[PDB]
Design a protein around this ligand. Structure first.
Ligand SMILES: C[C@]12CCC(=O)C=C1CC[C@@H]1[C@@H]2CC[C@]2(C)C(=O)CC[C@@H]12
Ligand SMILES: C[C@]12CCC(=O)C=C1CC[C@@H]1[C@@H]2CC[C@]2(C)C(=O)CC[C@@H]12
Ligand SMILES: [Cl-]
Ligand SMILES: [Cl-]
Ligand SMILES: [Mg+2]
Ligand SMILES: [Mg+2]
Lengths: 129, 130
């Protein structure tokens, strides 16, 4: 793949959600360019390169009990960037919860993720009331 | 207001769509910083200049038949930023249409939009069922 077109970005970003949904760490990390960055949440220090990004997904996901699902379409540009809204389901205080997140992802020429930025906070965490 | 809290982001961003939907250009342009930038769509170069931004909202909304509504929660950071998903309704090519967009914003200590970036392209355009 060359630089993804809009249409390609949409496909790549959907794929990435499934891969979080099924917890495949090696297939996610392989989607990232070798020298990519993660900011998640945006505002925290970035993470640099595949070693540091695999250590991140293994912390966040490795324990299981995390599902994800797109909660609308992928918005996609003509420069290799897109953004998507989704919901994470996991466990908070021994019980289910939902976290609502938006990721913005810039791709390089090769169809991999150069930069990821995940917009969420505690205001986006919900439970059963 | 100083950077805005996350809860506060959220308010500035829902209020902003509320304004877009009502079509108040001058209300919309004031929410910005003297030196704000818009990138809409992301990837097209920034515009800049309060006047360069009123004309942006004047070109975009000046018929009065645009509508806009959040389609899920604003996602806000603790560093004065947020992201939001919304759906724009308008007529184009004689057809009832809709556009799905995500805007990313930052703000300033005073709660003025400092940057904005609107993610969307023609892949997000569609025709509304009858
Ligand atoms: C890494 C992650 C998924 C991939 C993605 O793109 C965005 C996020 C951000 C929220 C993470 C989540 C994984 C599960 C996490 C670690 C929790 O249990 C608390 C916060 C949450
Ligand atoms: C300016 C705008 C609303 C405010 C906002 O926050 C983001 C956008 C970007 C898409 C614009 C839309 C207004 C209506 C436009 C001009 C169309 O008819 C096609 C593209 C679309
Ligand atoms: Cl949506
Ligand atoms: Cl949503
Ligand atoms: Mg699945
Ligand atoms: Mg490279």
């Amino acid at each position: 793949m060359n630089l993804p077109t809009a249409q390609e970005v949409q496909g790549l970003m959907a794929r990435y959600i499934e891969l979080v949904d099924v917890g495949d760490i090696e297939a996610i990390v392989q989607m990232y360019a070798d020298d990519a960055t993660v900011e998640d949440p945006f505002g925290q220090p970035p993470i640099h390169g595949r070693e540091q990004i695999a250590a991140f997904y293994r912390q966040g996901l490795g324990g299981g009990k995390v599902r994800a699902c797109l909660t609308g379409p992928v918005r996609a540009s003509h420069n290799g960037c897109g953004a998507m809204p989704f919901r994470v389901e996991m466990v908070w205080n021994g019980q289910p919860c939902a976290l609502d997140v938006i990721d913005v992802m810039r791709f390089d020429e090769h169809g991999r993720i150069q930069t990821m930025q995940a917009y969420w906070s505690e205001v986006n965490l919900s439970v059963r009331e």
